[PDB]
Design a protein that fits this description.
The PDB classes it as lyase (aldehyde). The structure is a homotetramer of 206-residue chains. Chain A is an alpha+beta fold. Chain A is built from six helices and seven strands; from the N terminus they run H-E-E-E-H-E-H-E-H-E-E-H-H. In chain A, helix 1 packs parallel to helix 5 and helix 3 packs across helix 5.
């Protein structure tokens, strides 16, 4: 839990997301719980030009260290850590399939047993609100209360876990589930799902 | 047939599957027939962190060597080698297209002459059962009796052959067939197929 | 603003577009505003065989330096710089998703808040005209008057910005928007959109 | 035109096709016109294990040099060079999109002006016949009479040009056209096309 060791992982995660096809462009942001606040990527700086010195610290009051501009979405990373006290890392990206399902404004159902990875029998979709807005924060906070990941209507995906690699794994897993959903939904509607009872069993085995 | 030479190939195969886009995440497992039992990847350890020392040996009774946890699916690798005595390697993954067709719970038909590569005129889809369950084993064993590969409903794909590279080749081939199926089925239903007589001829030439 | 420093970026951009999957083959062309005219890639020379010496200079009259053949599309790069005086770089490619939407002859609507990146609430589609034609130039010039990017019916995409990297970023962003559009339109028609009022707000925050 | 310089390009082409996503597995074959016959890849040997020594020479009578097994499709490479005397290289692959359109048994229409690259206003689809069959040869020969590329029903794609790189470029271009076709056809049927008159003009400019 050294600011320097955290900064390095944060950039790695951004690089890994681009590497996995879960994000590209100036989209996305990542943070880790640090001290009273968190360490978060800065607004609009390409993952390729990022360095530990660019990572920003925001305290419990929302005070970011001077001369640095935190991610426009810092408020919903805030709400994420408050909604999920068990979570130490938040990952946000505009992954293609997760984003398309969010344009459709649909929760992703129990089409695969791995859905249980997000903590339940669905991946919810949170109502739209202007990006970097406080109202957007209320929407995600509410969605993450009982799920580890949530889609953002007309926006993207946000997943959080105990650490960055488990947070990245989860976000990656949701891109797979979102892709399985879009592919089968184009051929059939509704797409077959496992029953809630079955999901209960799978959650027991997890 | 040296434990060490086998361990190395097993990890390579996992790396190659990720490399080919046939698997990603903590999904998938691979094993080779070894002595009375088999050598199989361990449960939940990233392909990147895998080493020959992590590969687990399970004997004919299902006894895995102490201090090591075999893949949760070890039972259906077992059933695979019992159902197909001609097979020396099993590959399991959650490849995107194979998995979507399995959510649709459909066999993949004779849409391409390469379907004959799995031993017949179809790639079956085995009924769902909780992962790592003995009932799941009964389902795959039954499906592999007359086919070298089978989809797992709401789960993924399992392919086996005489060795790991032929097992990987086959699994890869089925991802192609599953992708040709999903793409044409979105435009037309039913998708045109070669006749069984034609498949018979192709099987003769193989 | 040295001819040599510009030539290098132009080739890089072509390489980066192939690298991002926004273009492949002998398709595409890129130019930068230079002196009274511009520096533009040459017609039909693989990005791999390109060198600073191949980059062509065309003056304000359309006079390209002797012994060099400029891109067949040089006329619409011309029209682009005249239509958008704020723009210093033009990028053209036959990116898969942008091109499919252009075959459908549709503008891309407000399906995502990033649509505002092109300057409005849509990505227009300019009427077809034979490639490398002066009439094609009139069509793009007209489309770029109030937008930074435009699709070309039955052809591809053209995006321009203040410099090559912002021009490449934008073109990349439009491939994402075009892909979100094609994926959701196959499942639903019309695809849900953000209201113009909302887009207005997002444009204010940009 | 040295056997050794040709062998090297042939393998490169196979490697490049896998690299571009136009082929994978043990599928595909490539040949160049050599002396009275041709040099062609051998049947069933992974592109990774190929060497100049594996390339096979078949004479005008179909006599392949001893101890070497030519590609099962050597007969249709033969027919290709006889149908198109202007062609010096043939490329065959089971590229995903070209193959799906061939399962649908459709010609690819004038959806993009680049269709003119294959010599006309369409990419035909040749009737199925067992692979490596003489009747399959009659089908491709007939299709290539007035086109440089043809799809093979329930099989794949075959493209030929004056040399391997122009043959690879063309095959790659057809994968793009086949992908634009499948994507728009899922949303609309029939997919809008340029008129034959327009294609005539484009063919004039080519
Ligand atoms: Zn965002
Ligand atoms: Zn599994
Ligand atoms: Zn163009
Ligand atoms: Zn073939």
């Amino acid at each position: 839990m050294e600011r320097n060791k955290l900064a390095r992982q944060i950039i790695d995660t951004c690089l890994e997301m681009t590497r996995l096809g879960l994000n590209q462009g100036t989209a996305g942001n990542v943070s880790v719980r640090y001290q009273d606040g968190m360490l978060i990527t800065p607004t609009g700086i390409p993952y390729e030009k990022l360095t530990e010195s660019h990572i920003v610290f925001i305290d419990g009051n929302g005070k970011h260290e001077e001369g640095k501009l935190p991610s426009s979405e810092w408020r919903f990373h805030m709400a994420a850590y408050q909604s999920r006290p068990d979570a130490n890392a938040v990952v946000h990206n505009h992954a293609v399939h997760c984003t398309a399902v969010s344009i459709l404004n649909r929760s992703i159902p129990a089409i695969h047993y791995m859905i249980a990875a997000a903590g339940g029998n669905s991946i919810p979709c949170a109502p739209y609100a202007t990006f970097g807005t406080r109202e957007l924060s209320e929407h995600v906070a509410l969605a993450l209360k009982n799920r580890k990941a949530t889609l953002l209507q007309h926006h993207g995906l946000i997943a959080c876990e105990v650490n960055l690699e488990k947070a990245l794994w989860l976000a990656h897993e949701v891109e797979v589930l979102a892709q399985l959903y879009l592919t089968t939904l184009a051929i059939t509607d509704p797409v077959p799902v496992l029953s809630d009872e079955e999901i209960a069993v799978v959650l027991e085995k997890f």
